[PDB]
Amino acid sequence: GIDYDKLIVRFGSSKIDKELINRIERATGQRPHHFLRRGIFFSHRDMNQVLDAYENKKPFYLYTGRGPSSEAMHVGHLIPFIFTKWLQDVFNVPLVIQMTDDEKYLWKDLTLDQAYGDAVENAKDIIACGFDINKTFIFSDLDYMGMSSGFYKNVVKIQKHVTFNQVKGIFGFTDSDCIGKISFPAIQAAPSFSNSFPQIFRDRTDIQCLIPCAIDQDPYFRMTRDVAPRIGYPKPALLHSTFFPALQGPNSSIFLTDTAKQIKTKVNKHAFSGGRDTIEEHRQFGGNCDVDVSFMYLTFFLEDDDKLEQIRKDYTSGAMLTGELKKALIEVLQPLIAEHQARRKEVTDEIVKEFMTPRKLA
Amino acid sequence: ASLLELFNSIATQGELVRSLKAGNASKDEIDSAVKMLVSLKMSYKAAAGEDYKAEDFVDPWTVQTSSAKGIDYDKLIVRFGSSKIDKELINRIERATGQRPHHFLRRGIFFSHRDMNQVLDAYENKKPFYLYTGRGPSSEAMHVGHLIPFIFTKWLQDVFNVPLVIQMTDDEKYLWKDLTLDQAYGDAVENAKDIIACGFDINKTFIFSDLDYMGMSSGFYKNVVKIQKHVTFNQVKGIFGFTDSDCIGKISFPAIQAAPSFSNSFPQIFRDRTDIQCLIPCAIDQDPYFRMTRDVAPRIGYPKPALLHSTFFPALQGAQTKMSASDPNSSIFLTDTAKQIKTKVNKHAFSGGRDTIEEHRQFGGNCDVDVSFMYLTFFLEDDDKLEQIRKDYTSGAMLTGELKKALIEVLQPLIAEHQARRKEVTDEIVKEFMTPRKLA
Ligand SMILES: Nc1ncnc2c1ncn2[C@@H]1O[C@H](COP(=O)(O)OC(=O)[C@@H](N)Cc2c[nH]c3ccccc23)[C@@H](O)[C@H]1O
Question: Impact of altering residue 106 to C (chain B)?
């Protein structure tokens, strides 16, 4: 499939090797998450710096976000949230999650209230991922900007040190775009600096930030990292993941709303197959796990490394047929999604409100 | 002697350093100018005993014309597409306030407007309206020219008895100049004292700094974002002359100056109401921001702000440019002493009189290019006396020195009284003016 080792060279990032993974295990005392064991999160920037601080009792915080969608969230979207939740638990650090409602308002046909409405709704799905309410701040840009003595100030600092020419290349803007889009990159970068959240870190500016993201986003975070020293702040560290495969690449992906029945259908009739044409060729040459979306999905959601390896072998040999594989996946997805919907149902307005209230995170 | 020559050079270099600090010069440029000032003063301390004792272009940053008579304001009205203030509008304001039209209105200083009749309609129908004006902070760089908008705004507040919001654009200063946020905010708080000293009613006036208020308002940023969606980069390149090499902060700044035009940007003052009419007093060089704001308003469901535009108080050197702290010897500062005011008028105010007293007696003076006379039209409140001075100077009966002496007698008390009032502005009063809260 995709040659991720080349993307590392292309972007200039660092490969997450076994020694780093072992160091993470020693620092936390926890077994490394399966995304690390399987190369899902394979690249980074300054992770050793983060561990240097952590090992010396100098904590950091996590930062991630989400563009509020009209309840159009699929299993692929779970990846960074699942990893961020794991990072939060094993390092036991605070986390800030930005809901870019102002971004959606600027890019989509929505009123400011509708954009905000989508953000609060999406927040429920994020809360359903299990983040600890005592250490997690989920904020709406539209709301938080007007109730922070540090966020806007950081936005302006960034705005002063980034030119249109710079963002034009990185984000592909043209002078036909509204000024709101042009300066937005500063708002997405501001959360990377601790003094943007006074209610959490007060006036401290030395608390390193760690951002889990997709490798193809490295160019975007490069802007934030380059501006950091220019404004006297530490650069945020990054952890890069691979690309979540499209079902093939309403039926282009499996949504967190889909029912058990819908999940079955999606996998059996739409999930791309890496097996052979006829059962004759398959029992001989076997199936290819590098392109079979059904198996790739398993590498992300099946936690048992042993069962996953067994399924791989039998699918590559021919002993196991595509239909058998797709059923193994369905047995993994149905409960995964069912449990998410169940937890989402428990998210009360009182809960979402608390998560969204700027407050100290003991 | 040569010792005098040294003294003058230090004064000149000092005036230069002051203008640089007031303009957009970088810290390095300023530092280099200072090193010379310092070096030039060290040489004086030696060669002496003591140390040393002391076509028309109009946009938000520049006012330029080659005409000694200044900007052609009627033409500017056509170019900007605004409306001339006629006798009937003035008479209507008089009937609505029961007050004599301010002399700025009577003499065509505030000569242009946008929707003033909409404002009067609302007022006469018992509907509320609020005033909004602003200032780009700069440590004691405020000159007499700055009094035009502020004196008039205070007059409007008095005769209409309406609330007022004054924006101190410290973020604008931070984006365009070389300074820290604390410095920028500091200048906002200082200039605020100059403003308050104009006499604004503390029960109806809210003065806010962008840097500080943006982070404590449930409505300001939301309006900024709404505005930002309806203005393209191309549009601001055409209106303000921005380029692709400008920082993104400068490019979106226009939305910040537009936001105060909408009442719900101030929830602590007007709650959630979005129908409060807004009137914006300013010199016409600020119109670009609001012509843009007016086109955006209906797209986001708000009323268009009305405007009242004033002409420019000219630079001492002549009406070719406006008075500006950025230009050497161009301004008469609110911090100047009586002696300084006197010296600036006599030594720098461009004269429309003849070269010789003989020629002056024979041909008289030209009030259309004489800076001292122009200044009188702004501050000499007595119309008949203004007219008498005009006739006498024009006939040659009055000499330039007499004309300048009359102006000096007007400017000294004007500024001295301001300083007297600024001296009474305590840190508690400034903090109260800048505290968001309901306005009586
Ligand atoms: N020579 C002159 N003669 C007469 N009036 C003059 C002269 N020079 C300046 N002005 C007027 O003074 C006010 C403040 O000037 P600023 O350049 O600080 O102004 C600025 O830098 C703006 N970004 C601040 C601002 C924000 N919101 C506003 C709303 C209305 C007016 C101004 C603002 C203005 O009314 C300006 O027109």
Answer: In NEDMSBA; uncertain significance; loss of function; failed to rescue both the eye and head size phenotypes in a zebrafish wars1-knockout disease model
